[PDB]
């Protein structure tokens, strides 16, 4: 259904045949980021639910794979599995808890 990520197609009639118009999705403008497989916080390893960990050099974000939309690494877009002593390449950061400002107010 064409080259790229397929979205829609439209048939057209031709003599002794058919013509398809495949609408696809092509990524355009790229950038370089530093990435990690997991985040170590409070003796625990955090893996993203959907997305990928990236860093611009100083701070760490989580964004979807096919588009650069960074956001804060919280407990609602990460899940905990085990400790930090097994995963190769795990880095140190902090994971935000949304219940902390609501409990303090």
């Amino acid at each position: 259904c064409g080259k790229g990520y397929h979205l829609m197609s439209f048939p057209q009639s031709a003599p002794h045949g058919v013509v398809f118009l495949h609408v696809t999705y092509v990524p355009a403008q790229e950038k370089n980021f530093t990435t990690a497989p997991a985040i170590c916080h409070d003796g625990k390893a955090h893996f993203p639910r959907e997305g990928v960990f990236v860093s611009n050099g100083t701070h760490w974000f989580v964004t979807q794979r096919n588009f650069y939309e960074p956001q804060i690494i919280t407990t609602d877009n990460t899940f905990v599995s085990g400790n930090c002593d097994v995963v190769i390449g795990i880095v140190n950061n902090t994971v935000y808890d949304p219940l902390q400002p609501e409990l303090d107010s």
Binding site: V26, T35, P37, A38, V52, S81, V87, G89
Partner: protein, 99 residues
Amino acid sequence: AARDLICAQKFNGLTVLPPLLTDEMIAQYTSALLAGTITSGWTFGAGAALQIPFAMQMAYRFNGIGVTQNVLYENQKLIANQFNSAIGKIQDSLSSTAS
């Protein structure tokens, strides 16, 4: 020595044309596909080659089949050993069996 079969074939008007791509070009295309699918993943088949670490690519591959992606991150050495053993078994089976 004796007359070959191919000389009797060519002397009666039956020739064989060479293919357009030599085997070096076939190996070059195969090497380009291998380098793309190792370095980038599936991103080079949909546009520009987007680099990614191979462990994270294989974590995406496990996420595609219904396994959570941490299972690779606690079994990475075992999975690499199993892949290397399977490649060696393919090499042994190709060196032994010819049918």
